[PDB]
Amino acid sequence: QSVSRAAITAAYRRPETEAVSMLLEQARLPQPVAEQAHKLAYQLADKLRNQKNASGRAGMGVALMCLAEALLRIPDKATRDALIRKGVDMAMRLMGEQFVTGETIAEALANARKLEEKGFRYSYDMLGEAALTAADAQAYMVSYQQAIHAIGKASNGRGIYEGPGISIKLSALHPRYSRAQYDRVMEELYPRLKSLTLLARQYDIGINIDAEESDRLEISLDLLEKLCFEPELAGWNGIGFVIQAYQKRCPLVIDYLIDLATRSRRRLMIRLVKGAYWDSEIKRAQMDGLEGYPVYTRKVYTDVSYLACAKKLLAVPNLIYPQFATHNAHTLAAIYQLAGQNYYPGQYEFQCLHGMGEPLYEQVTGKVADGKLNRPCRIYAPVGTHETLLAYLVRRLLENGANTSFVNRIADTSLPLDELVADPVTAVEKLAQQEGQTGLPHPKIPLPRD
Ligand SMILES: Cc1cc2nc3c(=O)[nH]c(=O)nc-3n(C[C@H](O)[C@H](O)[C@H](O)COP(=O)(O)OP(=O)(O)OC[C@H]3O[C@@H](n4cnc5c(N)ncnc54)[C@H](O)[C@@H]3O)c2cc1C
């Protein structure tokens, strides 16, 4: 292929100067919106850093304190004045626990209530991906079936917005998905996706297809296309799909999705993310030796792409329920403002990962009289034992450990608040004036052919 599909194909690896130049005006916050976004972002990030006065205590060497402490333990003021494989497995489960909501779906669900009463929602992720065998994919299938039964019974008619949903990885459902051919995916994967989706619809819970590696985008769109035209799914708006703003294709995938929601007569649930596989995408493209990268190479370009994509999503509320997944205070503030006045619950939600967004979103989800923004947030809740945790944990380490990540820069007491929440468009134009051209690739990431 259609007009919208062909345009996705042709954007696959377009030069960054071109891709970034085209996004800029789509991403620019109008003057007054930009300033309310800055102020809100500043406030959120200020509260985050300085929850337990962490920066005001910088406002106030160590051996002296130990002596002042021992002196303060003198009870009477007068007296005082007068005076390899195992290490890896272990470190994985130790660092990883903070990102896991429970080992079983029942355990995760039984803990649902605490944050659900505060206005939080949930999307449960049965950990495990990249099925290597036919038996592996069968077992993931039954784990997903089981989870939908338990989630749906706990949802108990609350429906797709207020009630819990499930997130699935297509790589879990087909052996060797990474190299699978179109014909085998449709024969084998598609009937399992269709079956899980029919089940979710019986319980009226959301079912989201997670986005994985970029060379799987095209087959996931073929699967989505077919799925949206199932008679048993007519009139039901529970299908969800993730799109990754670090991809050059993202804006064009949105044109496609908008046309699909129209033709298939539904409102799609669309989770907009930046993306979780950047380091691997860069390595992969450098080994393939093709004309360029399917993702941006500077983090600020991804931020620009996200804002442009968020605007496009918010413009079509009859066709799309946008789910804005982020832990970045500026991104959140910019969305809040871009969504305009006269919020209604079913306009959009925020999303965050378990063990990562709680402090940001404790300022967001809840009553205005308690100082909150009163916007719903859906927590993505990984569920599994130690044997399913590895790949997810490594992605979290890369996310938390990168110096370009907001969750890393916020902990840096030396980087000032204004720089942390600086506007990405303005950042890009600043690079452009310094370097001579808009959207130049990262200086340390040359094209694969160089
Ligand atoms: C609820 C939820 C669900 C998610 N589901 C998925 C999913 O299905 N598939 C998926 O891929 N991701 C998914 N993610 C996103 C991913 O796991 C990270 O959480 C997310 O990208 C972090 O973005 P941020 O705005 O929180 O952080 P920010 O710190 O503002 O931006 C972080 C990031 O920018 C990108 N980046 C980093 N360096 C560069 C660079 N040099 N050049 C270009 N881009 C760069 C990467 O996307 C990286 O995560 C999900 C996130 C959430 C909250």
Helix %, strand %, coil % of the chain (to 5): 55, 10, 35
Give the distance (Å) from ligand 1 centre to CA of residue 303: 10
272 closest CA partner among 254, 294, 295:
254
Task: Judge whether 51 and 449 are in contact, CB under 8 Å.
Answer: no
Measured in residues, the chain has a length of: 450
Map residue 353 onto helix, strand or coil: strand
Cα 246 to averaged position of ligand 1 atoms, centre (Å): 8
What is the radius of gyration, based on Cα positions, of the chain? 24
Distance, CA 277 to ligand 1 centroid (Å)? 8
The values of phi and psi at residue 81, to 5°, are -65, -40
**Using CA atoms, how far apart are residues 274 and 328, in angstroms rounded to an integer?**
11
Pocket test residue of 125, 215, 274 for ligand 1, highest count of atoms within 8 A of CB: 274
Q: Are 74 and 150 in a shared domain?
A: no
Contact present, 208 and 174 (Cβ < 8 Å) = no
Cα distance between residue 209 and residue 241, in whole Å: 5
Query: 200: which 2 tokens?
Result: 């979710």
Q: Say how far apart CA 273 and CA 245 lie, in whole Å.
A: 6
Q: How far is CA 142 from CA 135, 136, 318, in A?
A: 11, 10, 34
Three-class DSSP labels, 270-295: EEEECCCCHHHHHHHHHHHCCCCCCE
In the DSSP assignment, the letter for residue 440 is P
- 374 phi and psi angles, rounded to 5 deg: 60, 55
In contact, 262 and 230? CB cutoff 8 Å: no
For every residue of 147-190, DSSP letters joined together read: HHHHHHHHHTT-HHHHS-EEEE-HHHHSTTGGG--HHHIIIIIH
Give the other-Cβ count within 10 Å of 39's Cβ.
13
Q: Tell me the sheet residues that pair with 321.
A: 269
Q: Tokens for 326?
A: 């982020």
Question: For residue 124, which of 89, 96, 149 has the smallest C-alpha distance?
Answer: 149
If asked whether residues 254 and 320 sit together in one domain, one would say yes
Same domain as 226, residue 198? yes
Same domain, 155 and 233: yes
Residue 241 near residue 6 (C-beta atoms within 8 A): no
Please tell me whether residues 70 and 216 are part of one structural domain.
no
Domain range for 316: 1-59+84-450
Count of CB atoms situated within 10 Å of the CB of 219: 18
Residue 440: both structure tokens together: 């130049």
For residue 220, how far is its CA from the centre of ligand 1 (angstroms)? 19
Tell me how the structure was determined: X-ray
Count of CB atoms within 10 A of residue 116's CB? 17
Ligand 1 site, residue 51, Cβ cutoff 6 A:
no
In the block, tokens 């079956």 appear at 195
Burial status of residue 447 (CB atoms within 10 A of its CB: 0-12, 13-18, 19 or more): middle
Ligand 1 nearest-atom number relative to CA 357: 53
Cα-to-centroid distance, 275 and ligand 1 (Å): 4
Angle (nearest 5°) at CA 333 between 443 and 297: 15
- Residue 183 to residues 5, 87, 113, 221, Cα–Cα distance (Å): 19, 42, 43, 14
Which is nearest to 155 in space by CA: 126, 196, 128, 123? 123
Q: How many helices (H) and strands (E) does the chain have?
A: 23, 8
Give CA separation, 178 vs 155, 159, 200, in Å.
Answer: 33, 33, 26
Residue 274 C-alpha to ligand 1 middle, in angstroms? 4
Q: What is the largest CA-CA distance in the chain?
A: 89
Strand partners, 353: 380
Torsion over CA of 106, 276, 314 and 256, rounded to 10 degrees?
-100
What is d(CA 265, CA 259) in angstroms, rounded to the nearest whole number?
Answer: 10
Cβ contacts of 346 within 8 Å, gap of 6 or more = 161, 321
Per the structure, the count of domains in the chain is 2
Whether 98 and 203 map to the same domain: the answer is: yes
340: left (phi > 0), else alpha (psi -120 to 50), else beta?
left
Neighbouring-strand partners of residue 168: 209
Same domain, 38 and 116: yes
Going by C-alpha positions, the residue among 277, 237, 313, 233 that lies closest to residue 392 is 277
Domain shared by 285 and 237, yes or no: yes
Domain's final residue, options 48, 83, 118: 83
Beta bridge partners of 167: 125, 208
CB 17 within 8 A of CB 440: yes
Structure-block tokens of residue 243: 């799109």
In this structure, the answer to whether residues 25 and 74 fall within a common structural domain is no
- Give how far Cα 332 sits from Cα of 45, 110, 359, 361, 413, Å: 11, 29, 13, 10, 21
Strand partners, 102: 383
| CA angle in degrees (0–180, nearest 5) for 226-124-196 | 30
SS3 41: helix
Q: Which atom of ligand 1 is nearest to the CA of 303?
A: 30
The CATH number covering residue 72 comes to: 1.20.5.460
Helix (H) or strand (E) run with residue 156 in it: none
The resolution in angstroms reads 2.0
Count the Cβ atoms, other than its own, within 10 Å of residue 409: 17
Residue nearest to atom 45 of ligand 1 (CA): 299
Task: For residue 57, report the phi and psi dihedrals to the nearest 5 degrees.
Answer: -90, -20
**Exposed (0-12), middle (13-18) or buried (19+): which is 107, by Cβ within 10 Å?**
exposed
Give the list of residues 6+ apart from residue 16 with CB closer than 8 angstroms, or none.
248, 292, 293, 296, 297, 298, 301, 439, 440, 441
54 in the same domain as 35: yes
Q: Whose CA is nearest to atom 24 of ligand 1?
A: 326
Report the Cα 342 to chain-centroid distance in Å.
Answer: 25
Residue 388 Cβ inside 6 Å of ligand 1? The answer reads no
- Nearest alpha-carbon partner for 420 in 36, 45, 31, 39: 45
Query: Which residues lie below 8 Å from residue 145, measured CB to CB, with a gap of 6+?
Result: 196, 199
Domain check: are 67 and 38 in the same one? no
244 lines ligand 1 (CB under 6 A): yes
Using CA atoms, how far apart are residues 450 and 440, in angstroms rounded to an integer? 15
Q: What angle do CA 280, 282, 283 make, to 5 degrees?
A: 65
Do 248 and 390 lie in a common domain? yes
CB 121 within 8 A of CB 167: no
Instruction: Please tell me the distance between residue 185's alpha carbon and the centre of ligand 1 in angstroms.
Output: 27
Task: Please work out whether the CB of residue 273 comes within 6 Å of at least one atom of ligand 1.
Answer: yes
CA atoms within 13 A on the CB side of 291: 7
Residue 154 phi, psi (nearest 5): -70, -35
Q: Give the domain CATH number at 48.
A: 3.20.20.220
Coil, strand or helix at 235: coil
